[PDB]
Symmetry: C4
Subunit: 92 residues, 4 copies
Amino acid sequence: VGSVAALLTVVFYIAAVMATNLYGATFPEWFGDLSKSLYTLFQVMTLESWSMGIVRPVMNVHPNAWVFFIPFIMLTTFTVLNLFIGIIVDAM
Amino acid sequence: VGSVAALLTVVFYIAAVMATNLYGATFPEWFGDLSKSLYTLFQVMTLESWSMGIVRPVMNVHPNAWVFFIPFIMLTTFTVLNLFIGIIVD
Amino acid sequence: VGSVAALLTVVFYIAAVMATNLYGATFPEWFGDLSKSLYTLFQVMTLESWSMGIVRPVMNVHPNAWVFFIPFIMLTTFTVLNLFIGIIVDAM
Amino acid sequence: VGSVAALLTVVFYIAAVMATNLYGATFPEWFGDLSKSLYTLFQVMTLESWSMGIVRPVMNVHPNAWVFFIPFIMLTTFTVLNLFIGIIVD
Ligand code: NA
Ligand code: NA
Ligand code: NA
Ligand code: NA
């Protein structure tokens, strides 16, 4: 439960560092600094406008942006699901 | 199960009171009164257009709005998940 | 499991009948006929653009539209969750 | 768990082949090639803008497009839920 939250924080920070470098110059409102990137990757994790709002516009400059975002989604969404179930199971 | 629904209603009302005060003047369509706020925070909880539709436009006036909305999402979505599982288990 | 799918079909049809009558005249693209309504209520159940795309525009003509849509969401989303878990539990 | 991931990959590929043929000519940005189709069907599976962004605009050319997309959603979202629970249980 604690290790799951620790793995998610580390992965979320590493990805936000990676995103700032990759799309920061071309998409500064979404990835211009670490803070902007952490906020965008939280939104992407909630699946809110991830494709129409973020990744499709990013792919028009970086055609392989999906190699970062789709595995990011698949990982964080599974980890969050594993985390929330983990708290509920430990409570019972 | 009942206490979970009670905790969620209290938290949802407190947050709706907080939102009306914070962004009611600058965003009156989404937070102009308690009723408008309760409706918006229900939408934010369902994750529908929370960032592109609500929080990014709010952050252009209030840059720290994320300190209210991200913890609100993390709390209510976990509580709802705990509530729905609670009914199914019982 | 079967009764859950039966309850969901009945509720989904009743709601689609209710919506066609309520918002069909003022929002004919989303609720103009039973077929259009069933499609919109399926979208509303998946939570896709339910508020920005459907219910906020509907509330500008019908201010109490939320009395129909919010309880519809709370019911169908809980029933679907109960249905999907029901199949998985019965399979094991 | 492995067979669930195998069933999902096969179904996802078959559907992406089907979509390219069906709406590739009329919607080339979303279904112009197998790669574009696989990306769109992943988005549709996450429920992101599936109706307002994809299926409503597709239905204005192909009125029965819902016969492909609604069953696609019902299948893949159930399979993914079955997959994620499968890993956690194991
Ligand atoms: Na959305
Ligand atoms: Na969504
Ligand atoms: Na969702
Ligand atoms: Na959206």
